[PDB]
Amino acid sequence: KDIQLLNVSYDPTRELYEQYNKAFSAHWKQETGDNVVIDQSHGGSGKQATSVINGIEADTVTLALAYDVNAIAERGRIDKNWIKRLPDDSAPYTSTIVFLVRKGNPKQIHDWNDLIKPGVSVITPNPKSSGGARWNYLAAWGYALHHNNNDQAKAEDFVKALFKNVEVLDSGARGSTNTFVERGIGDVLIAWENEALLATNELGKDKFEIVTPSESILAEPTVSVVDKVVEKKDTKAVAEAYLKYLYSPEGQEIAAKNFYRPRDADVAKKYDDAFPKLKLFTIDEVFGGWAKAQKDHFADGGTFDQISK
Numbered sequence: 001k002d003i004q005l006l007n008v009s010y011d012p013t014r015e016l017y018e019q020y021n022k023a024f025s026a027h028w029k030q031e032t033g034d035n036v037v038i039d040q041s042h043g044g045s046g047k048q049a050t051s052v053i054n055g056i057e058a059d060t061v062t063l064a065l066a067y068d069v070n071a072i073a074e075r076g077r078i079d080k081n082w083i084k085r086l087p088d089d090s091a092p093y094t095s096t097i098v099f100l101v102r103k104g105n106p107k108q109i110h111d112w113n114d115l116i117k118p119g120v121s122v123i124t125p126n127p128k129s130s131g132g133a134r135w136n137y138l139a140a141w142g143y144a145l146h147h148n149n150n151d152q153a154k155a156e157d158f159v160k161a162l163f164k165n166v167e168v169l170d171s172g173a174r175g176s177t178n179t180f181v182e183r184g185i186g187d188v189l190i191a192w193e194n195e196a197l198l199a200t201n202e203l204g205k206d207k208f209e210i211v212t213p214s215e216s217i218l219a220e221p222t223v224s225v226v227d228k229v230v231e232k233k234d235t236k237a238v239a240e241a242y243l244k245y246l247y248s249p250e251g252q253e254i255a256a257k258n259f260y261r262p263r264d265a266d267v268a269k270k271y272d273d274a275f276p277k278l279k280l281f282t283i284d285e286v287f288g289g290w291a292k293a294q295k296d297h298f299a300d301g302g303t304f305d306q307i308s309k
Contacts, residue, residue, distance in 0.1 A: 005239060058226050059225070059226060065219070097132075099190060102208060111214050122166045123166070123179055126171055144158035177198075193219075249264055
């Protein structure tokens with residue numbers, strides 16, 4: 001049979017899925033004789049979730065954080081208990097947040113505190129549409145808390161000061177990366193680690209340098225089958241198989257090659273030297289999980305709205 005799947009994903013996974021889709025299709029045909037074609041859609045995680053809620057017939061969603069999937073489940077398109085369906089809370093790989101600066105680090109950026117200095121132009125996406133934007137915001141807030149004796153007012157002041165320095169707020173993380181690298185705007189990009197490594201290895205070798213902060217957040221992008229769509233399109237078996245294969249040694253290696261941190265020990269050892277080492281905190285330990293964080297910081301009249309005013 002000929003099967004057509006649609007994967008609605010976050011912004012920077014464009015390269016990953018171009019490569020992964022060809023490997024999964026070859027694998028599925030080998031095992032079943034069927035021909036599967038996967039179409040891709042990319043954009044800020046928030047915006048993408050909304051589009052699915054409003055009619056995009058995605059078989060699978062591969063978003064930047066668990067909240068965005070939950071938002072679709074809350075609207076009834078996905079089973080409420082979707083996170084337990086795949087291992088590691090449906091997160092086949094992890095990432096983190098680092099800084100990308102221009103060659104020679106002319107503004108002498110060393111840690112989070114340097115981003116609030118006068119005259120520094122910061123590039124970070126919009127928390128209202130981007131998943132990476134929200135990870136970035138939590139990383140900076142977590143740092144502030146940890147450097148201010150857990151004083152939330154001081155952390156809010158810190159983040160206010162960081163946002164005052166933001167020159168362009170793109171809607172998706174790949175837009176942020178293009179603004180910095182391609183358009184040459186900004187002194188520092190608060191980037192997904194995969195974007196920083198892609199920029200220094202491909203999008204512009206010898207023009208950029210990564211700065212690893214003292215601590216950052218552990219980012220866990222999450223995947224899910226869209227129950228209501230697969231039940232209509234008769235694609236549950238292949239959609240489920242597509243997400244499970246991300247955990248295969250082949251899927252993990254494709255992730256690693258594209259600068260995402262793999263879970264598979266065999267793959268991590270093989271691509272070890274690529275990932276900076278740094279202290280990571282999680283969303284559960286510092287913010288009480290996604291439900292609480294989203295509420296507190298990104299819902300209407302949250303912390304973000306507050307510091308923007």
